[PDB]
Write a protein that binds this ligand. Structure first.
Ligand SMILES: C/C=C\C/C=C\C/C=C/C/C=C/CCCC(=O)O[C@H](COC(=O)CCCCCCCCCCCCC)COP(=O)(O)O[C@H]1[C@H](O)[C@@H](O)[C@H](OP(=O)(O)O)[C@@H](O)[C@H]1O
Ligand SMILES: CC(C)CCC[C@@H](C)[C@H]1CC[C@H]2[C@@H]3CC=C4C[C@@H](OC(=O)CCC(=O)O)CC[C@]4(C)[C@H]3CC[C@]12C
Ligand SMILES: CC(C)CCC[C@@H](C)[C@H]1CC[C@H]2[C@@H]3CC=C4C[C@@H](OC(=O)CCC(=O)O)CC[C@]4(C)[C@H]3CC[C@]12C
Ligand SMILES: O=C1CC2(CCCC2)CC(=O)N1CCCCN1CCN(c2ncccn2)CC1
Lengths: 286, 57, 235, 336
């Protein structure tokens, strides 16, 4: 029984690390993919690679064994690392959204004041937010109940820390991404909308095709983000405030946790394995 | 465009008045130059890396 | 390795590369526009209109390619006039692969006029052939064209005097500025075989001190925004 | 007028003369020659630092320093042994198609869509490269230029005319006319006395520098000629064209000797060059690759793949130790 889940988790962890490493290598060895947007996508791939090599094998070990036989200090370190890397992945999604928003709505900034320094600053702020969410449980906001059961590696369920982490890691990022991509959708629609009959019909068909394309792309991005992380953070916000009468199945909790972890697998697919530049670069490599 | 016709015909007759050798002799001279300098052609014969200045100093 | 001359050479190379990176960053902040058109197609009028108050942001006259650097709304444009390059275009057009846009200027008033090379060749037809050639090069698949239709007033006077049927025998309609101008604009628009990849921004050149540069800026910013949207996958 | 009539007669006569001299093709003569075999060239150096499509390069006579001209308004002097940028000359016009490095190494040339040949004095009292001279008079884009000596330079333009300039005086010493298309290439003879120019009329022309008149005309190509290079002997040359072929012509035989073309190549040639012995003809193509042909056999001896964009320029050192290929992907590659 544990063999099946072990091999499934191993396949997931191998696919995630392979995809993220391939994206990082393609950006590193290709000068074509060395702009600010591709730098942000590559940093997202690096973060997901860290999530796949430092968090997803230990998470799989905890899942198959149904117990954390690694120690309390290792448990705390690996919770801090998991929080840091997942928050960094989510805020890389937000940084990509913000860079896209500035590119679409500010061409003057895109031409004049947009440099790889901007990508470096966005990545630094992303990792800074990850650290600001990851460090508090190591220096406070911890309850003795987490140490009550040595055979577990659950995150801190402090109400203050629950609100802090769940909001500054997913919910504030979720509203930020929703607002930025809604504004980007408005800008894209404005740009798309703005014999003679045949030319007008062709223009209308092109406009509807572009509207469908932008709706599909934004749906892919936001739906991947939501269906990956929203159930997990809904659970992580509701459960600490519902001590009783809200028992959660172990299977459902594991499925939701690994749905959250699958964002690291899907991010290279959404942001790298879909645009034409990466596909051309990979074809030239292979 | 008649003034340029005289220049063109003069150029053509000047080109036709040159001395030409057989293609066999030209090919033989080309072969002789290729084989005489084949020993001194680093691209033809890969030079050892000891004296190759783009691989090892 | 550790010799003084080698260290000095490496330091000089590093300083040179830093200056190269600075120059490349500075040159990436400028919008490169390829100015094209016929001889008497209003290209000089457009050039003068752009460099009215904002210009340049023993040498020898070059006469090969003109550079016009002007700044509008904090955007730097370099416009390349290659009208004096009397040679084969396909041997140097690939040098302009990567310009933000091609500003193609045609005179509306040259529909009646014909080229001095031969009577049976309209100037408007020559401009149309040049536009068709440049809009469909392999080097300009994704490059948008800002189309300027210069000399609107002279064209209006000419169509008041002479009919437009001489330039377009297939054309049929009332002779007025609006209809004839729209017909010429549509004829130039229909030359775009790359309808999906590129767009043509048509403007009728006016005497206002800043509306032509405003149209160029709007077209360039639209091109940049649409290219960014294509990068994101929303266009 | 009636002149054209005898003109074509002369043409026919010329052809007949060539048909009189064509007894055994170069393929038949070199049939018994042992094949060169597969040529293994691996990228030794990768010169990085250009930020736009490189259109020209030229090796130095010391076989160590070269010059590369790119559309980022940059004329970079490269120390290929150490990949160290000796100089980075800012061009007054970023539209540069050609560059030449003087045989003495004191000067370097460039030119392009600006119809000017800029001569920069590399070696000066302050160690700073300045525009020593700006040669003007060409009415078309400067497609090629080659330093005849330290003071004279031969340049070819897009108004269908070459010109020998005296750099000190600053005006055209002689003008070579006769081409009916834009000269796109120009090769200097080893003895400095003659030079061949390939133009857009699918013809090459051998000119005498001192006399200033067309010695010979070679009409074998089907499309415009982009590249030209003397055989090291000086009695032959090779021309690459957009006909997807190179052609080896002979000065003494006044006719085409060999045709280097394969069915797998449909792209034009941007640059051709010979090895030190002349046995290898290295041609850069539009298919992103360089092909090394056996000059005596017309067989592809190798492929110098490795450039992301079109290989625009190519050159073999004077000692033949290495071949450098530039490309539109903003890199040079020293191969050896
Ligand atoms: C009912 C009516 C209507 C609805 C019904 C049907 C239609 C819609 C259904 C719902 C959609 C589901 C997902 C669709 C995805 C899809 O169609 O993908 C296309 C096909 O590519 C491949 O197949 C190839 C992709 C290969 C990916 C890698 C595979 C391996 C991944 C594992 C990694 C480890 C091993 C390498 C490619 O992309 P696309 O068509 O989706 O369109 C765009 C995409 O959405 C933008 O994101 C992208 O921008 P980016 O953000 O920079 O990436 C754009 O460039 C563009 O590609
Ligand atoms: C396995 C777990 C991680 C769940 C994964 C869910 C995704 C596979 C779903 C969630 C939201 C879906 C998207 C929601 C809405 C749209 C818009 C839709 O737009 C259209 O082109 C339809 C026509 C139109 O809008 O006019 C295309 C499908 C798409 C991208 C869907 C694609 C599939 C998505 C990304
Ligand atoms: C985003 C796309 C590519 C789909 C991603 C699929 C994953 C979200 C799936 C695939 C395999 C699944 C796993 C397969 C088996 C198990 C074992 C399962 O074990 C139990 O039933 C534990 C509870 C108990 O029985 O006591 C818990 C869920 C889990 C980890 C699953 C979690 C969700 C996973 C990782
Ligand atoms: O699988 C494990 C084992 C570890 C230790 C080794 C690897 C992980 C520890 C562990 O708890 N779990 C179960 C997962 C719980 C949820 N994860 C996802 C990320 N989370 C989050 N991200 C950002 C902000 C707030 N929360 C919290 C932790």
């Amino acid at each position: 029984y544990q063999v099946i889940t072990s091999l499934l988790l191993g396949t997931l962890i191998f696919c995630a690390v392979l995809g993220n490493a391939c994206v990082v290598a393609a950006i590193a060895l290709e000068r074509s993919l060395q702009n600010v947007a591709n730098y942000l996508i590559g940093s997202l791939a690096v973060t997901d690679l860290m999530v796949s090599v430092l968090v997803l094998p230990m998470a799989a070990l905890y899942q198959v064994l149904n117990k954390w036989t690694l120690g309390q200090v290792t448990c705390d370190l690996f919770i801090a690392l998991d929080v840091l890397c997942c928050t960094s992945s989510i805020w890389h999604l937000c940084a990509i959204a913000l860079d896209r928003y500035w590119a679409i709505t500010d061409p003057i900034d895109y031409v004049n004041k947009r440099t790889p320094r901007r990508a470096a600053a966005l990545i630094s702020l992303t990792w800074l937010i990850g650290f600001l969410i990851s460090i508090p449980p190591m220096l406070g906001w911890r309850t003795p109940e987490d140490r009550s059961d040595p055979d577990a590696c659950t995150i801190s369920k402090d109400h203050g820390y629950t609100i802090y982490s769940t909001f500054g890691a997913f919910y504030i990022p979720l509203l930020l991404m929703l607002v930025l991509y809604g504004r980007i959708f408005r800008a894209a629609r404005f740009r798309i909308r703005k014999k003679n009959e045949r030319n007008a019909e062709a223009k209308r068909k092109m406009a509807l095709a572009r509207e469908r394309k932008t709706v599909k792309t934004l749906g892919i991005i936001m739906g991947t983000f939501i269906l990956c992380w929203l159930p997990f953070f809904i659970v992580a916000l509701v459960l600490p405030f519902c001590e009783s009468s809200c028992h959660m199945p172990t299977l459902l909790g594991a499925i939701i946790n690994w749905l959250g972890y699958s964002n690291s697998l899907l991010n290279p697919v959404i942001y790298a394995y879909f645009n034409k530049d990466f596909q051309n670069a990979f074809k030239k490599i292979i | 465009s008649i003034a340029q016709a005289r220049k063109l015909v003069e150029q053509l007759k000047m080109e036709a008045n040159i001395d030409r050798i057989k293609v066999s002799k030209a090919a033989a001279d080309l072969m002789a130059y290729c084989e005489a300098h084949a020993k001194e052609d680093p691209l033809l014969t890969p030079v050892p890396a000891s004296e190759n200045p783009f691989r090892e100093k | 390795t550790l010799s003084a001359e080698d260290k000095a050479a490496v330091e000089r190379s590093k300083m040179i590369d830093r200056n190269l990176r600075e120059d490349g960053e500075k040159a990436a902040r400028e919008v490169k526009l390829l100015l094209l058109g016929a001889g008497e197609s209003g290209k000089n009028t457009i050039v003068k209109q752009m460099k009215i108050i904002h210009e340049a942001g023993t040498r020898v006259k070059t006469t090969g390619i003109v550079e016009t650097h002007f700044t509008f709304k904090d955007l730097h444009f370099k416009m390349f006039d290659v009208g004096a390059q009397r040679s084969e275009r396909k041997k140097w057009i690939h040098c302009f692969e990567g310009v933000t846009a091609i500003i193609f200027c045609v005179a509306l008033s040259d529909y009646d006029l014909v080229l001095a090379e031969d009577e049976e060749m309209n100037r408007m037809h020559a401009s149309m052939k040049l536009f068709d050639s440049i809009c469909n090069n392999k080097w300009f698949t994704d490059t948008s064209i800002i189309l300027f239709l210069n000399k609107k007033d002279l064209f209006e006077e000419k169509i008041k005097k002479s009919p437009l049927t001489i330039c377009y025998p297939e054309y049929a309609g009332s002779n007025t500025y609006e209809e004839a101008a729209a017909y010429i604009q549509c004829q130039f628009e229909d030359l775009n075989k790359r309808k999906d990849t590129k767009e043509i921004y048509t403007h009728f050149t006016c005497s206002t001190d800043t509306k032509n540069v405003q149209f160029v800026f709007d077209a360039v910013t639209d091109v940049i925004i649409k290219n960014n949207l294509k990068d994101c996958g929303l266009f | 007028d009636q002149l054209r009539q005898e003109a074509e007669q002369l043409k026919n006569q010329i052809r007949d003369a060539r048909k009189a001299c064509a007894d055994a093709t170069l393929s038949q003569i070199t049939n018994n020659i042992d094949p060169v075999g597969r040529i293994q060239m691996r990228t030794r150096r990768t010169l990085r630092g250009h930020l736009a499509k490189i259109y020209a390069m030229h090796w130095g006579t010391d076989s160590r320093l070269l010059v590369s001209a790119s559309q980022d308004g940059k004329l970079i002097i490269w120390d290929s042994y150490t990949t160290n940028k000796v100089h980075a000359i800012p061009l007054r016009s970023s539209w540069v198609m050609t560059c030449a490095y003087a045989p003495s190494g004191n000067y370097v040339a460039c030119g392009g869509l600006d119809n000017i040949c800029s001569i920069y004095n590399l070696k000066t009292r302050e160690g700073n490269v300045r525009v020593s001279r700006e040669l003007a008079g060409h009415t078309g884009y400067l497609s090629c230029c080659r330093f005849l000596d330290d003071n004279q330079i031969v340049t070819s333009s897009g108004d269908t005319t070459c010109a020998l300039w005296d750099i000190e005086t600053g005006q055209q010493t002689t003008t070579f006319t006769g081409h009916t298309g834009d000269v796109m290439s120009l090769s200097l003879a080893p003895d400095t006395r003659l030079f061949v120019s390939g133009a857009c009329d699918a013809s090459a022309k051998l000119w005498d520098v001192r006399e200033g008149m067309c010695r010979q005309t070679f009409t074998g190509h089907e499309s415009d000629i982009n590249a030209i290079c003397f055989f090291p002997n000086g009695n032959a040359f090779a021309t690459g064209s957009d006909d997807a072929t190179c052609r080896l012509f002979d000065l003494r035989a006044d006719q085409e000797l060999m045709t280097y073309s394969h069915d797998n190549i449909i792209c034009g040639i941007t640059s051709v060059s010979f090895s030190k012995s002349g046995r290898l003809l290295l041609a850069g193509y539009d298919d992103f690759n360089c092909n090394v042909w056996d000059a005596l056999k017309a067989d592809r001896a190798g492929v110098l793949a490795g450039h992301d964009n079109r290989v625009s320029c190519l050159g073999v050192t004077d000692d033949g130790m290495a071949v450098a290929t530039g490309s539109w992907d903003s890199f040079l590659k020293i191969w050896n």
